[PDB]
Design a protein around this nucleic acid. Sequence first.
RNA 1: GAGCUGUACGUAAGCGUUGAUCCAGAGAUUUCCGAAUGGGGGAACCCACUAUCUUUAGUCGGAUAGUAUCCUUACGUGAAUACAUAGCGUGAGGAAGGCAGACCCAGGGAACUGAAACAUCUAAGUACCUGGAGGAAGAGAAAGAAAAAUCGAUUUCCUGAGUAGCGGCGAGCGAAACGGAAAGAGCCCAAACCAAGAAGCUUGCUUCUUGGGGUUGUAGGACACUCUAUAUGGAGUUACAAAAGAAAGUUAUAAAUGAAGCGGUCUGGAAAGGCCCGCCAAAGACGGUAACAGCCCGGUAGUUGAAAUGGCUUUCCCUCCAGAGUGGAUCCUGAGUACGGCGGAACACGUGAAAUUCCGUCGGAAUCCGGGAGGACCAUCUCCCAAGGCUAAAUACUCCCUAGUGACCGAUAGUGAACCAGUACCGUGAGGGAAAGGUGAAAAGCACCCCGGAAGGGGAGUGAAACAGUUCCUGAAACCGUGUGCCUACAAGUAGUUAGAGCCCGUUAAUGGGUGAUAGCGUGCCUUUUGUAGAAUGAACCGGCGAGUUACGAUUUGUUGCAAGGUUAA
RNA 2: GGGUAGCGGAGAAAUUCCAAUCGAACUUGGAGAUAGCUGGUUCUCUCCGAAAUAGCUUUAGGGCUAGCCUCGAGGUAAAGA
RNA 3: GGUUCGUGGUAGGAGAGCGUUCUAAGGGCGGUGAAGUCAGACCGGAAGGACUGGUGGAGCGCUUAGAAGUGAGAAUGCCGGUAUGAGUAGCGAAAGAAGGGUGAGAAUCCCUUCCACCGAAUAUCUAAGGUUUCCUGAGGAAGGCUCGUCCGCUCAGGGUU
RNA 4: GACUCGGUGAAAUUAUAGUACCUGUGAAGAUGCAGGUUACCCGCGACAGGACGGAAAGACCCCGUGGAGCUUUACUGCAAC
Lengths: 97, 95
Amino acid sequence: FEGGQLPLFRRIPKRGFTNINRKEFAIVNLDVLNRFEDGTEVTPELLVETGIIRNEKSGIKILSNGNIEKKLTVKANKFSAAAKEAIEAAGGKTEVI
Amino acid sequence: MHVKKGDKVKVITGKDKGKSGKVLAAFPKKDRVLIEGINMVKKHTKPSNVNPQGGILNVEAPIHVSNVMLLDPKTGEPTRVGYEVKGDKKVRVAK
RNA sequence: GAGCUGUACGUAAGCGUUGAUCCAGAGAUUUCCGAAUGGGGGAACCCACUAUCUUUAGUCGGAUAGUAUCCUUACGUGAAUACAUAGCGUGAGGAAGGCAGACCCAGGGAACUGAAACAUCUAAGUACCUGGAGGAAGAGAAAGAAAAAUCGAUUUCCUGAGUAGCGGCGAGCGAAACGGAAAGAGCCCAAACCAAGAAGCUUGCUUCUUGGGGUUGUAGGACACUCUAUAUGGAGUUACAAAAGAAAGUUAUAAAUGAAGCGGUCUGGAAAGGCCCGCCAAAGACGGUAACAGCCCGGUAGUUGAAAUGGCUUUCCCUCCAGAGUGGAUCCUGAGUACGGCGGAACACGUGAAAUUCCGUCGGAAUCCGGGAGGACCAUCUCCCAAGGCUAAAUACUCCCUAGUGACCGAUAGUGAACCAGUACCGUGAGGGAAAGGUGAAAAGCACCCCGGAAGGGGAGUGAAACAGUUCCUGAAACCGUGUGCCUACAAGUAGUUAGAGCCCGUUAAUGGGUGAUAGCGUGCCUUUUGUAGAAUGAACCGGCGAGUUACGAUUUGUUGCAAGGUUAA
RNA sequence: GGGUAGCGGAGAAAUUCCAAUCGAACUUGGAGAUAGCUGGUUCUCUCCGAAAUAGCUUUAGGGCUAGCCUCGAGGUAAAGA
RNA sequence: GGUUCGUGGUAGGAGAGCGUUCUAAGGGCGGUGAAGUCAGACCGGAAGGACUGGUGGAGCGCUUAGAAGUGAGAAUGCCGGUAUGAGUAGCGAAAGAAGGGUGAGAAUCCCUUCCACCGAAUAUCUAAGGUUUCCUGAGGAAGGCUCGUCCGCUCAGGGUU
RNA sequence: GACUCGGUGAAAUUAUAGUACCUGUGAAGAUGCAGGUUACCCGCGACAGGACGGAAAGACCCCGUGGAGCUUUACUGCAAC
Ligand SMILES: [Mg+2]
Ligand SMILES: [Mg+2]
Ligand SMILES: [Mg+2]
Ligand SMILES: [Mg+2]
Ligand SMILES: [Mg+2]
Ligand SMILES: [Mg+2]
Ligand SMILES: [Mg+2]
Ligand SMILES: [Mg+2]
Ligand SMILES: [Mg+2]
Ligand SMILES: [Mg+2]
Ligand SMILES: [Mg+2]
Ligand SMILES: [Mg+2]
Ligand SMILES: [Mg+2]
Ligand SMILES: [Mg+2]
Ligand SMILES: [Mg+2]
Ligand SMILES: [Mg+2]
Ligand SMILES: [Mg+2]
Ligand SMILES: [Mg+2]
Ligand SMILES: [Mg+2]
Ligand SMILES: [Mg+2]
Ligand SMILES: [Mg+2]
Ligand SMILES: [Mg+2]
Ligand SMILES: [Mg+2]
Ligand SMILES: [Mg+2]
Ligand SMILES: [Mg+2]
Ligand SMILES: [Mg+2]
Ligand SMILES: [Mg+2]
Ligand SMILES: [Mg+2]
Ligand SMILES: [Mg+2]
Ligand SMILES: [Mg+2]
Ligand SMILES: [Mg+2]
Ligand SMILES: [Mg+2]
Ligand SMILES: [Mg+2]
Ligand SMILES: [Mg+2]
Ligand SMILES: [Mg+2]
Ligand SMILES: [Mg+2]
Ligand SMILES: [Mg+2]
Ligand SMILES: [Mg+2]
Ligand SMILES: [Mg+2]
Ligand SMILES: [Mg+2]
Ligand SMILES: [Mg+2]
Ligand SMILES: [Mg+2]
Ligand SMILES: [Mg+2]
Ligand SMILES: [Mg+2]
Ligand SMILES: [Mg+2]
Ligand SMILES: [Mg+2]
Ligand SMILES: [Mg+2]
Ligand SMILES: [Mg+2]
């Protein structure tokens, strides 16, 4: 309340809408994949058993933040262009489940 | 109550401890007892009442029942009281 | 198992081991009023009638029983009106009223208030009124939730989430499903059709009652055939049909038994306390007892106990009972219903793009080649089968009962009410509504003497104490007095303070106490104000009571644990 | 002895009367209504210490942001006086 | 431990504490006298705390933590008590007097006589309403605006055909 | 009636009071502050100038995004027709 001066929120317009079908992916940055042993197959079920992602919202998406050392066969629902390149640059095979 | 009228009790507390008497009356609602020659009080009696001369009457006053112990004629000592059944009715027993 | 005839301060007359009083179960009696019901009535009263009996010479009296109204249902009578219906009468059943100021469901339904005004909106479907109830109610076995590809009645909790939404898009309002739990249980009809009547006479076709049958979705049933059951088995009064009993066990409603110190000594009115020795403990709970007790008393742990009544659990009795497969000719599967228009309401959802659910009104389907839903609507797909009914548990609340608990109160508190309190008192009435606890261990409650009409005292006595004396533990302050150390009748005073003689004392022994001639200085406290000694506000005084709290969220700082992790909720 | 009752009665009319209440009785409840107003708000010492302004406001004795106070923490061509 | 600069203060911010009730745990005090209460010339920087003695007659500190119905001088606060005004206003329309009596006590109760007042009432019935106030015998705390031996008051008995 | 005596015995009010006057000062009108001027201590009967005396949180006046009653071609409604 501003003692009758029109409050800030009424001076400015409403914006946008909420998507009923909004997807939100659990994010896994390369750095945490180093945790795993070399020549390992990394699945969603393995990522939740390890406890790297507890809830798997809409699917698991791999992002590039950091760098990767080990050779891994990483299956996730999504990869960033940089993720795919970085996993492959180490010598891995990204599968999209 | 562990004692009743007729019983020979020993007094174990108060100014009259060591003194034994006979139970003249029991007031089980008050949990008090009247022992012959125990707890003498000087009652300042006006003449009007039974006693047409009146005067300072030296009479017994009730004692609390938990202040007397029953006498066993055999031992001749104060004793706690247990209850044993002969067959028809139960009777008090010394221990 | 020895006293008893209730409080409570009596007098009298009595009762009781040939077992009283007392405690528990079961009976009997139970005036009048009150729904109040034979009629009436200003509740606790008045006045009957009809039988039967009783009393009197008969009136006059007495006793017992019946006699309200409505609904349902038999039976009888029975009008306008011929049959008949209404009406009227009799007999059965049933209802009526109350309440736990709670919880539950329904009908009806505010306003203050919030929105810094106010009308939509909020408060709130709250308060309140009315009806219905039940120990719970409501809900409930998908025309469901969904779309991880599946789940499998309902309810309640955690979560989702202050999210999605709603909203003068303001104030505010605010889900649900998924997921996790508690608890779990499923059933009966209507209709095809079969049999038996009954009627209409559509006169062998139709609709009405009773029984059988039958209960559901890529369908189920009827209907055809087929296999076994016809109590072999199975199931029950909590739904699934309904009323009966027994017996045994167990719990409740009285009780019983129950260890160990009269230990010594000290103080004291008294010992349970101190000091010094013992002892019991499945018992060191609690209370009482002349101060604080495991061993004094009632008890406590443990172990026993019920003639009678009630509850519960079993077992027996009793009662009741068909359930698989195969086809799809035909038939059945809830109609003024679903749905729609108009007007409202409920849905978190304010008419909105408004699905879903209900009410009034009007219109009004399909009916298995069928129908509904998936948030306008169409198509596809998926899931379901409405317009009939029943259903325990997990949930809500507490007038009550039993046993317990409290970093809850302790007499201005705690209930309004510790005490004869919803009393006294106030009010025409609805209604409002107090104040008021403590002698002592024990009445031992003050014989007797003295003054006084008494009251009240002073002795004497009781008691540990009476300066504990029947309202009587303690006994503060205001306020009222008596006595006196210092001062005071030439003084102008917010009353003190600083200096200070004199006089009087003698301490928690201090460069002490009381008083104060005289001298200097000096306009209370609080509130509110630019500013108050204020001729502004508040307080007569003293005492008690009397105002930032808690819950749930948000945020920030501190602390602690763990740390790319941390943490669980029910 | 009766009748009319508060969103109501009654009034040869005054806002007149309806139980010492009437421009809308009384009582209980909603209810601790709301009160930007007035009053009040209880122990101590230590350190610091304002404001009575601007802007906007159905705002003017209210409020909000800023200014001025305080506590903590940061950071350095130290920028303050 | 020193040095330097500081230490008036309303609203208000910050800090450290005092005291109250209750709980826990340790450790104590108390009938050879607890709490409370009264008094005092004692101690601490403050809130406050001891000690000694009287009263009191049975419970209460201390330490460390914890929790709050946690502190009053003001609210025309609420309840209670008690002042002040003050021996003041008032004692509610009115004619009394003396003698005798009763009694502890008499202007005030009883009796006598005279006087005075009402008399379309201040008389006699009676309805309402009240509900025992009626009668008799005791009484004199309170009530009665004084007093009181008296009473519509207190206590007993009675009384309505 | 007042007043005196005997009996009985309230109240409003009240921060504490040892409570003069003048001129001044001050929140601008002082018993209480300053400078002076007066004044022995305690009462009783009287009078009201002051204590901005008591009494009532001023009814006038203004203010409150307070009420209430009333009006209408204020707004929005509702009955009724
Ligand atoms: Mg017997
Ligand atoms: Mg009757
Ligand atoms: Mg407002
Ligand atoms: Mg024993
Ligand atoms: Mg001795
Ligand atoms: Mg004692
Ligand atoms: Mg005791
Ligand atoms: Mg509609
Ligand atoms: Mg709505
Ligand atoms: Mg649809
Ligand atoms: Mg319709
Ligand atoms: Mg539909
Ligand atoms: Mg859709
Ligand atoms: Mg939607
Ligand atoms: Mg169907
Ligand atoms: Mg009380
Ligand atoms: Mg007390
Ligand atoms: Mg007394
Ligand atoms: Mg002199
Ligand atoms: Mg002179
Ligand atoms: Mg005043
Ligand atoms: Mg916080
Ligand atoms: Mg009137
Ligand atoms: Mg309300
Ligand atoms: Mg400063
Ligand atoms: Mg505006
Ligand atoms: Mg300072
Ligand atoms: Mg200074
Ligand atoms: Mg602070
Ligand atoms: Mg105490
Ligand atoms: Mg005291
Ligand atoms: Mg308090
Ligand atoms: Mg006070
Ligand atoms: Mg006077
Ligand atoms: Mg006078
Ligand atoms: Mg006079
Ligand atoms: Mg008179
Ligand atoms: Mg005349
Ligand atoms: Mg008389
Ligand atoms: Mg008198
Ligand atoms: Mg008399
Ligand atoms: Mg006089
Ligand atoms: Mg002047
Ligand atoms: Mg002067
Ligand atoms: Mg003055
Ligand atoms: Mg005045
Ligand atoms: Mg005013
Ligand atoms: Mg006014």
